[PDB]
Amino acid sequence: QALLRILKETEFKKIKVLGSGAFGTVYKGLWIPEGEKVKIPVAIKELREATSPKANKEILDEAYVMASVDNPHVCRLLGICLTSTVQLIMQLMPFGCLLDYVREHKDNIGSQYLLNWCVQIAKGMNYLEDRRLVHRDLAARNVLVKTPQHVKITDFGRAKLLGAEEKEYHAEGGKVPIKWMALESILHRIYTHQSDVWSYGVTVWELMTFGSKPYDGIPASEISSILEKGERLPQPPICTIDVYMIMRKCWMIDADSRPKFRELIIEFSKMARDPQRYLVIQGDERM
């Protein structure tokens, strides 16, 4: 139940950069246990910014849950460095993220695969919700491919554990993935399990469009007022009215009108067992 290992930042050798963003940077690296000569390849995700004692406490709480995940669709935290800068130690994911996968396999991805990825992502989110984690970071670039049949949700220190009494999380200022965020989050910096549902919706949009960019063209600044105007992301060309109407429910203004992750698992599960009733892909069953 409590498995989290806290390691010395001196036990890691960075080897190459796998990626970098605003929020931090992922290294291909090497763990070398102190007192040991064995070297073991890890991914090292270290946060761009330094953190307050409050920030660390929250990352530390979330980290203890992450280090103990049962679920096939969430990446387990291997270890953590609470040194100068925080570093999450994750297992290497050589296929990379689902966002990349769908962009360069666009022509061989069938309705069956898309709908299965949605079920798996929802299962991982539903499980995180049971562990009381609000993910705050769900996007296609944060779903990793273990095999094309098997995807996993990963975290970069942004998830937040909720006290047994709490239903919200109110966040500080800073950089945010504003085009994946529920409107409450953008307006009031409040996050809940239901704002996670909003992001699931955008992530499913990302997949159904084979890697399209959300609100591409609009600056972050307008997003809030465009959503207030009623605009949402457009219906993807392969979506039936049934799939799209679900995305639209994920982007409802009242977060209690959005579906639950357990309902999302049920809907996409039935769709997943008759893919061609719901997605209209050209050459679909020829892939």
Q: Which two tokens stand for residue 91?
A: 């297992």
In angstroms, this model's resolution equals: 3.0
Q: Give the residue numbers annotated as catalytic, written as ranges.
A: 137
Indicate the residue type of 269.
S
Tell me how far apart the alpha carbons of residues 267 and 261 are, in angstroms, rounded to a whole number: 10
Residues making up the chain, counted from first to last:
287
Burial 125-153 (b: 16+ CB within 10 A, else e): bbbbbebebbbbbbbbbbbbbeeeeebbb
Tell me how far apart the alpha carbons of residues 107 and 196 are, in angstroms, rounded to a whole number: 29
Burial 91-121 (b: 16+ CB within 10 A, else e): eebeeebbbebbeeeeeebbbbbbbbbbbbb
Could you tell me which of 244, 239, 251, 117 has the C-alpha nearest to residue 196? 251
Half-sphere exposure of residue 104, counting CA atoms within 13 Å on the CB side? 5
Residue 239's DSSP bridge partners are 279
Note whether 187 and 224 are within 8 A (CB). Answer: yes
Tell me how far apart the alpha carbons of residues 138 and 143 are, in angstroms, rounded to a whole number: 8
Domains of the chain: 1-92 (3.30.200.20), 93-287 (1.10.510.10)
> What Å distances lie between residue 33 and 5, 55, 127, 180, 281, CA to CA?
12, 27, 32, 38, 49
For 122-144, the DSSP string reads HHHHHHHHHTTEE-S---GGGEE
* Beta strands 87-90 and 79-81, pairing class: antiparallel
Tell me how far apart the alpha carbons of residues 196 and 75 are, in angstroms, rounded to a whole number: 17
For the chain, the DSSP string reads -----B--GGGEEEEEEEEE-SSEEEEEEEE--TT----EEEEEEEESS---HHHHHHHHHHHHHHTT---TTBPPP-EEE-SSS-EEEE---TT-BHHHHHHTSTTT--HHHHHHHHHHHHHHHHHHHHTTEE-S---GGGEEEEETTEEEE---S--EE--TT---EE--SS---GGGS-HHHHHH-EE-HHHHHHHHHHHHHHHHTTSPPTTTTS-HHHHHHHHHTT--PPPPTTB-HHHHHHHHHHT-SSTTSSPPHHHHHHHHHHHHTSGGGTB--TTGGG-
Tell me how far apart the alpha carbons of residues 277 and 47 are, in angstroms, rounded to a whole number: 43
